[PDB]
Write a protein that binds this ligand. Structure first.
Ligand SMILES: C[C@@H]1CCN(C(=O)[C@H](CCCNC(N)=[NH2+])NS(=O)(=O)c2cccc3c2NC[C@H](C)C3)[C@@H](C(=O)O)C1
Lengths: 259, 36
């Protein structure tokens, strides 16, 4: 998270780390949307340009963490995925359209003071909260600046990072990029003149962009961290899987059919 | 999973349930009454 800050403890209790099993590395973020189900980005599992095509025993998931590094004994769950559901009209050969994936946990999680689901948006919360200039909340463990790498890229926070970042209006998301935008994605970030900064970066992808509804005091996940040209460049914005529109798919696969 | 609210969902045990606010929520509520 670029220009973010360390999160208080219990801040996104829905935050999930997507790790490779052996040898261990953090690959992506994801969120807990119930004691069985994790939403993350599709690019996290399958990116064919890069031969990435991860299966259920390449992968584990950690829940309830705050520090990136060391095992928080009392509070964290490692778990293995039972299944992996990637959208069929997911498009890796262009613009990462319909970039969403659902992961079925092996067994139910015991919910906790540090582990708790986030809600998916209804129609009305999408209608009331998705306006240009309204801010939502990205969190994650990824790099704090753009990098290449040396023997490691150096850029790894000890503790979970937060940034709050305003929704941006579509003809400016549009014109930020030569990439084809589709209604499945939105962008967010500060504009060159606004002189606040911040952005997801690598390793934050797959994670939640959440907004709090004042109406009921709940947090809703409106976005999944999808793609960027680099991290926090100016004149440039982060893009984000529009969860609500792909609510047709989500409820599909969870109820088997379901859409 | 449920849309709209799995009862306690998006109500964090350490924050809303203890009616404490986190260090950055007011920035968002700010952004709300900067718009509609
Ligand atoms: C394969 C995945 C695709 C998404 N990613 C990215 O988009 C990275 C990271 C940007 C982080 N900043 C941000 N989110 N604002 N930007 S990227 O390095 O320019 C790039 C790498 C490979 C594919 C693509 C990219 N650009 C957007 C394009 C539609 C898909 C990479 C990631 O690991 O996050 C690689």
């Amino acid at each position: 998270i670029v220009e973010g800050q360390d999160a208080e403890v219990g801040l996104s209790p829905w935050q999930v780390m997507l790790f490779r099993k052996s040898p261990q590395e953090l690959l992506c973020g994801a969120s807990l949307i119930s004691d069985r189900w994790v939403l993350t980005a599709a690019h996290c599992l399958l990116y064919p340009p890069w031969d990435k095509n991860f299966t259920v025993d390449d992968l584990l998931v950690r829940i309830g963490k705050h520090s990136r590094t060391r095992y928080e004994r009392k509070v964290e769950k490692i778990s293995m995925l039972d299944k992996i559901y990637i959208h069929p009209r997911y498009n890796w050969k262009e613009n990462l359209d319909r970039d969403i994936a659902l992961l079925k946990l092996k067994r139910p999680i015991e919910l906790s003071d540090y582990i708790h689901p986030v809600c998916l948006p209804d129609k009305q919360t999408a209608a009331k909260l998705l306006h240009a200039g309204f801010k939502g909340r990205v969190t994650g463990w990824g790099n704090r600046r753009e990098t290449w790498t040396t023997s490691v890229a150096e850029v790894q926070p000890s503790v979970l990072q937060v940034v709050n970042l305003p929704l941006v209006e579509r003809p400016v998301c549009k014109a930020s990029t030569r990439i084809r935008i589709t209604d499945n994605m939105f962008c967010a970030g500060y504009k060159p003149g606004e002189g606040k900064r911040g952005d997801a970066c690598e390793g934050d992808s797959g994670g939640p962009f959440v907004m709090k509804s004042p109406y009921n005091n709940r947090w809703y996940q409106m976005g999944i961290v999808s793609w960027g040209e680099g991290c926090d460049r100016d004149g440039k914005y982060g893009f984000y899987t529009h969860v609500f529109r792909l609510k047709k798919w989500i409820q599909k696969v969870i109820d088997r059919l379901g859409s | 999973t449920f849309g709209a609210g799995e009862a306690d969902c998006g109500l964090r045990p350490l924050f809303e349930k203890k009616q404490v606010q986190d260090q950055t929520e007011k920035e968002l509520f700010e952004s709300y009454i900067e718009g509609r």
